[PDB]
């Protein structure tokens, strides 16, 4: 030892024993009594009688300072040690309702610290256990926190029910509270995917405990709990509030307390509900049954007149009544919602929303040239969120035109509307930019609202002459970026709208950025398909619509743009368009067949995509479509004729080898010769066969003699039909050198 060395030794053991006491206080967790130190100070301040109300000092309103400060020293024992954090639980759990008029005054971020310092969940019910009574006597200012710390104390904890089935009554007891109805909802959808049936029927459970004291006429005034609460839960529980809703005396109950009594709010509050359930079919028409006389002298405060409308609207019950009708009925919903009456704005839209479907309300509102401005403008600018939908949905049923041998005998009103449609559409919504004005908002529109862009685009293209300007404003990027998402009805017919457009428009003026086989994709899906249809469901694709998609389809090959080739290429390439196209060759249905005539006709002339399969002929599927070829070059059907004339004719020149081989071909030669003779009338069809011929004898070398050709050489039919030709006429301004250095090649 050291210490045992000397006159007055100390024996080195007395020492260790020393050292150890002050390594033991040396050894063990830092700073844990300045922390719960801290902390009892703070919970010292629970000394003030009355349930250690929170001293005025802190509550206040600058006192946020001295708070700040006492929700750091909190969180600090609670989130630096596990010692300190176990101190402030028990200090709390000691105190529960002090603990909570403490924390109330806190953030809201605070919450975390109080409920992370409940360890396991049955320590959490003497906690419960104030709260349903905080809240009952709401007697506590801050109900949203201690809410708050409800919702939490679910979320963290696995809870039997029994346990929080009191949220449900204390909750409803309360729905008249903003402040509570919010928090409700939200407590709310978690209890029922957690207790599903259980809580499910708890509800209706508690709602009957209300009904049964309505009728007794006994309470604080359930009636009101129960309608507030039935309207403000039947989208979240639209299934069980019907089954609530109709319970057999409650229907009488509510008209009672609204006819044998003022209650004008109460009247108001109904109505509320009323509209809330107009959900299935069945309940409409349920409102209608039961509650017909009350929306009918209703109409008369205006304290519940747009109340009691937009319930005879939604359920379509307006067509009882001999006290009003749709003119007046709507003038309503029109009067107040010329930048008037703001309660009244957003319903009013809703409402007119639907009644904008019966045309005396179309007509009556496309004439109320200012109401259509307000309207505009509550689109554009306003940026009034929830009323876009119906304004919207209004500015689709307004642009809506119908939809529609020889007839020389003798009805027109028709011409009418037809007129006032298109003027419209023109007018308000064309130069009002709103369709370019929609395509920047397009990225933010609610999935629905989308939708009613692409029915208000679809009714402009009703009408071929708007689709260029409807083009500059961005529409085909509008209609082709939305297809680019999700078997809809809406999307066949921003389908049709794409196809109209892309019919009517330049592909160099719109796809001169964008590229083009992006519409591709679109187009056929208006035409037949090898594959398992789409996504199925409903609507169908008329044949109607294999003309119209076949029409656009070739204006995108016409372009000679190297984006055409481009075009032609995924055509004739993706084997299921191909196959496609092939087929609807020898559709027996003529426009159809010639559409399809004119398509191969275009794509022909950037050959290298499509030539080899009709001109190639060593190959059986091409010598196949070379023969069929052959024959519509004399159908009945004369503007196919001219299609299957062009593309023999330019391939016989584009490509002199094929020309060549043609020479040899007798039906080819044959038919090409009759109809040239017996339909020298058409001028497009005789200007495209000599072309041919052009092209034909271009590759017949005159001096080779060794080599000659019959059918072309000789063929008195040919030769003199290719004089009668040249007898003047008609013979075309370029393509009448050539019939005499052609006839220089006859016998």
């Given at each position: 030892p050291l210490s045992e060395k000397g006159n007055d030794p100390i024996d080195s053991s007395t020492i260790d024993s020393l050292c150890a006491a002050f390594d033991k206080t040396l050894k063990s967790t830092p700073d844990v009594q300045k922390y719960n130190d801290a902390i009892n100070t703070i919970?010292?301040?629970?000394?003030?009688?009355?349930?250690?109300?929170?001293?005025?000092?802190?509550?206040?309103?600058?006192?946020?300072?001295?708070?700040?400060?006492?929700?750091?020293?909190?969180?600090?024992?609670?989130?630096?040690?596990?010692?300190?954090?176990?101190?402030?639980?028990?200090?709390?759990?000691?105190?529960?309702?002090?603990?909570?008029?403490?924390?109330?005054?806190?953030?809201?971020?605070?919450?975390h610290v109080f409920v992370?310092?409940?360890?396991?969940?049955?320590?959490?019910?003497?906690?419960?256990?104030?709260?349903?009574?905080?809240?009952?006597?709401?007697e506590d200012t801050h109900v949203t926190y201690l809410l708050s710390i409800i919702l939490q104390l679910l979320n963290k904890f696995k809870y039997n029910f029994k346990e929080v089935r009191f949220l449900v009554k204390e909750l409803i007891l309360r729905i008249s509270e903003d402040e509570v109805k919010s928090m409700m909802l939200i407590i709310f959808a978690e209890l029922q995917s957690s207790f599903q049936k259980d809580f499910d029927k708890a509800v209706v459970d508690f709602m009957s405990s209300l009904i049964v004291e309505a009728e007794i006429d006994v309470g604080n005034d359930p009636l009101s709990i129960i309608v507030k609460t039935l309207s403000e839960?039947?989208?979240?529980?639209?299934?069980?509030?019907?089954?609530?809703?109709?319970?057999?005396?409650?229907?009488?109950?509510?008209?009672?307390?609204?006819?044998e009594e003022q209650?004008?709010?109460?009247?108001?509050?109904?109505?509320?509900?009323?509209?809330?359930?107009?959900?299935?079919?069945?309940?409409?028409?349920?409102?209608?049954?039961?509650y017909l006389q009350l929306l009918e002298r209703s109409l008369n405060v205006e304290d519940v007149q747009i109340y009691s409308a937009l319930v005879l609207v939604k359920t379509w019950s307006f067509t009882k009544l001999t006290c009003i009708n749709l003119k007046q009925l709507s003038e309503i919903f029109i009067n107040a919602?010329?930048?008037?009456?703001?309660?009244?704005?957003?319903?009013?839209?809703?409402?007119?929303?639907?009644?904008?479907?019966?045309?005396?309300?179309?007509?009556?509102?496309?004439?109320?040239?200012?109401?259509t401005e307000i309207l505009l403008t509550m689109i554009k600018s306003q940026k009034m969120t929830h009323c876009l939908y119906g304004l919207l949905v209004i500015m689709a049923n307004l642009s809506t035109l119908p939809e529609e041998x020889x007839x020389x005998x003798x009805v027109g009103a028709e011409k009418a509307a037809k007129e006032d449609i298109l003027l419209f559409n023109e007018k308000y919504i064309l130069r009002t930019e709103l369709i370019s004005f929609l395509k920047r908002e397009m990225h933010n529109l609610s999935p629905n609202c989308k939708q009613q862009v692409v029915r208000i685009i679809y009714n402009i293209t009703r009408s071929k002459n708007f689709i260029p300007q409807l083009a500059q404003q961005g529409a085909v990027k509008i209609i082709l970026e939305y297809l680019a998402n999700k078997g809809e009805p809406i999307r066949i017919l921003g389908c049709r709208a794409l196809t109209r457009m892309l019919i009517f428009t330049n592909p160099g003026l719109i796809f001169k950025k964008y590229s083009a086989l992006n519409a591709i994709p679109f187009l056929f899906?208006?035409?037949?398909?090898?594959?398992?249809?789409?996504?199925?469901?409903?609507?169908?694709?008329?044949?109607?619509?294999?003309?119209?998609?076949?029409?656009?389809?070739?204006?995108?090959?016409?372009?000679?743009?190297?984006?055409?080739?481009?075009?032609?290429?995924?055509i004739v390439s993706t084997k299921v368009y191909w196959s496609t196209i092939e087929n609807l060759m020898?559709?027996?249905?003529?426009?159809?067949?010639?559409?399809?005539?004119?398509?191969?006709?275009?794509?022909?002339?950037?050959?290298?995509?499509?030539?080899?399969?009709?001109?190639?002929?060593?190959?059986?599927?091409?010598?196949?479509?070379?023969?069929?070829?052959?024959?519509?070059?004399?159908?009945?059907?004369?503007?196919?004729?001219?299609?299957?004339?062009?593309?023999?004719?330019?391939?016989?020149?584009?490509?002199?080898?094929?020309?060549?081989?043609?020479?040899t071909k007798k039906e080819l030669i044959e038919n090409a010769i009759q109809v040239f003779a017996d339909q020298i009338d058409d001028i497009e069809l005789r200007q495209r066969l000599l072309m041919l011929f052009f092209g034909l004898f271009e590759v017949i070398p005159d001096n080779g003699t060794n080599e000659v050709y019959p059918l072309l050489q000789e063929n008195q039919k040919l030769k003199?039909?290719?004089n009668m030709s040249l007898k003047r006429g008609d013979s075309g301004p370029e393509f009448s050198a050539a019939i005499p250095v052609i006839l220089a090649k006859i016998k």
């Open positions: 919970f010292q301040l629970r000394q003030k009688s009355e349930s250690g109300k929170m001293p005025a000092d802190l509550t206040n309103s600058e006192a946020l300072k001295d708070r700040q400060k006492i929700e750091e020293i909190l969180t600090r024992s609670y989130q630096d040690h596990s010692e300190s954090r176990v101190h402030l639980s028990k200090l709390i759990q000691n105190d529960i309702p002090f603990a909570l008029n403490l924390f109330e005054i806190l953030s809201r971020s605070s919450i992370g310092c409940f360890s396991n969940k049955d320590a959490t019910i003497a906690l419960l256990n104030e709260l349903q009574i905080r809240i009952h006597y709401g839960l039947y989208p979240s529980l639209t299934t069980l509030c019907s089954e609530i809703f109709l319970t057999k005396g409650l229907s009488k109950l509510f008209k009672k307390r609204v006819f209650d004008l709010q109460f009247t108001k509050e109904l109505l509320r509900l009323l509209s809330s359930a107009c959900i299935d079919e069945t309940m409409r028409t349920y409102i209608t049954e039961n919602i010329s930048r008037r009456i703001v309660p009244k704005v957003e319903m009013s839209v809703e409402a007119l929303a639907y009644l904008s479907l019966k045309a005396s309300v179309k007509i009556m509102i496309r004439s109320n040239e200012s109401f899906e208006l035409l037949p398909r090898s594959t398992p249809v789409d996504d199925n469901p409903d609507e169908q694709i008329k044949l109607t619509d294999n003309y119209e998609a076949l029409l656009a389809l070739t204006n995108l090959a016409s372009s000679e743009t190297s984006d055409g080739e481009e075009v032609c290429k995924h020898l559709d027996e249905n003529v426009p159809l067949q010639r559409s399809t005539l004119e398509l191969i006709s275009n794509m022909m002339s950037h050959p290298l995509t499509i030539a080899a399969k009709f001109f190639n002929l060593e190959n059986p599927q091409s010598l196949r479509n070379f023969n069929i070829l052959v024959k519509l070059l004399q159908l009945s059907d004369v503007e196919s004729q001219r299609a299957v004339a062009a593309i023999f004719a330019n391939i016989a020149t584009t490509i002199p080898l094929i020309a060549k081989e043609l020479l003199d039909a290719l």
